[PDB]
Amino acid sequence: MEMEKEFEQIDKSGSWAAIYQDIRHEASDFPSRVAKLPKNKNRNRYRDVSPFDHSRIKLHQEDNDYINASLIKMEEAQRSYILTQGPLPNTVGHFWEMVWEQKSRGVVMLNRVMEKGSLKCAQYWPQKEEKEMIFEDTNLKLTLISEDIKSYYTVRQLELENLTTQETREILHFHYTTWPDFGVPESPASFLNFLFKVRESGSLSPEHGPVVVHCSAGIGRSGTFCLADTCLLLMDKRKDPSSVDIKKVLLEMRKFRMGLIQTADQLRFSYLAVIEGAKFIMGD
Numbered sequence: 001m002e003m004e005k006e007f008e009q010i011d012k013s014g015s016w017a018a019i020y021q022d023i024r025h026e027a028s029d030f031p032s033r034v035a036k037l038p039k040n041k042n043r044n045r046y047r048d049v050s051p052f053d054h055s056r057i058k059l060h061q062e063d064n065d066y067i068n069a070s071l072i073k074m075e076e077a078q079r080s081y082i083l084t085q086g087p088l089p090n091t092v093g094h095f096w097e098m099v100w101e102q103k104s105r106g107v108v109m110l111n112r113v114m115e116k117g118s119l120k121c122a123q124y125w126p127q128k129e130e131k132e133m134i135f136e137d138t139n140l141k142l143t144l145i146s147e148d149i150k151s152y153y154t155v156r157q158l159e160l161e162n163l164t165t166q167e168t169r170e171i172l173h174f175h176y177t178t179w180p181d182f183g184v185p186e187s188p189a190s191f192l193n194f195l196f197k198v199r200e201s202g203s204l205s206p207e208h209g210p211v212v213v214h215c216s217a218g219i220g221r222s223g224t225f226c227l228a229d230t231c232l233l234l235m236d237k238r239k240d241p242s243s244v245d246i247k248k249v250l251l252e253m254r255k256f257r258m259g260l261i262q263t264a265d266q267l268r269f270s271y272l273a274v275i276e277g278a279k280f281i282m283g284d
């Protein structure tokens with residue numbers, strides 16, 4: 001059913017809460033035994049948000065391979081994403097270890113360091129060119145190369161260096177800075193503009209490792225970003241773009257990480273972004 005019609009029918013009937021609860025009831029339940037080991041309590045931001053064992057990203061070390069991060073692999077769309085929590089003070093070194101080991105080109109950040117008067121993630125990148133960061137526990141160096149500040153987002157060029165090898169790599173940091181402290185944006189126009197800038201960079205393309213995407217828990221805003229991207233790619237590949245079922249795509253993605261899309265308002269905003277993003281290509 002053409003989702004724009006499905007959309008007005010849910011709005012007119014005000015059943016967003018009922019649709020969202022149906023998704024919560026049908027979603028996959030897989031074990032997360034590694035996340036719950038006592039040695040990993042200070043590696044998890046939230047007790048109720050854990051990566052499944054089958055899809056978790058493993059750090060390349062023998063000591064402790066755990067990070068709160070999942071591989072979302074979308075077979076028909078031919079896209080992969082890593083969804084992770086905002087880094088903690090004791091996991092900033094893990095975060096960069098992962099980016100290096102997985103050969104990612106891009107990091108996508110959908111939160112501010114402080115929101116609602118509380119810290120939502122560590123300051124994990126350098127703010128000045130001449131003050132680089134060294135991650136003692138992971139043997140890596142990170143330098144700010146340039147910064148482009150726009151009204152809705154900031155793009156940064158970073159240099160990541162393997163100290164022991166002396167290998168360097170350019171990482172692009174895409175920072176969406178205007179998601180409101182409460183609720184969802186009124187219009188999806190600036191979020192869709194941002195998604196199109198990440199695409200144009202090459203960060204989402206198969207010649208690189210998967211993009212690393214985070215917010216505070218790595219399920220809500222992060223979920224909205226991957227769901228919108230995959231739905232729009234499926235609309236450009238299929239003979240009938242009205243066949244794309246956003247509820248079925250979200251349940252496929254929930255096989256790989258729990259809790260993607262945290263509220264009925266995030267679900268409505270995801271439908272809105274896909275409907276509008278289609279018009280801008282399938283029309284404009």
Ligand SMILES: NC(=O)[C@@H]1CN2CCN(CC3CC3)C[C@@H]2[C@H]1c1ccccc1
Nearest residue numbers: 060061097100101137138139140162164
């Ligand atoms: N966290 C880790 O153990 C990994 C494995 N490797 C060997 C041990 N070395 C710790 C000694 C001080 C050099 C740290 C690094 C690190 C890493 C390497 C290359 C790129 C990104 C990260």
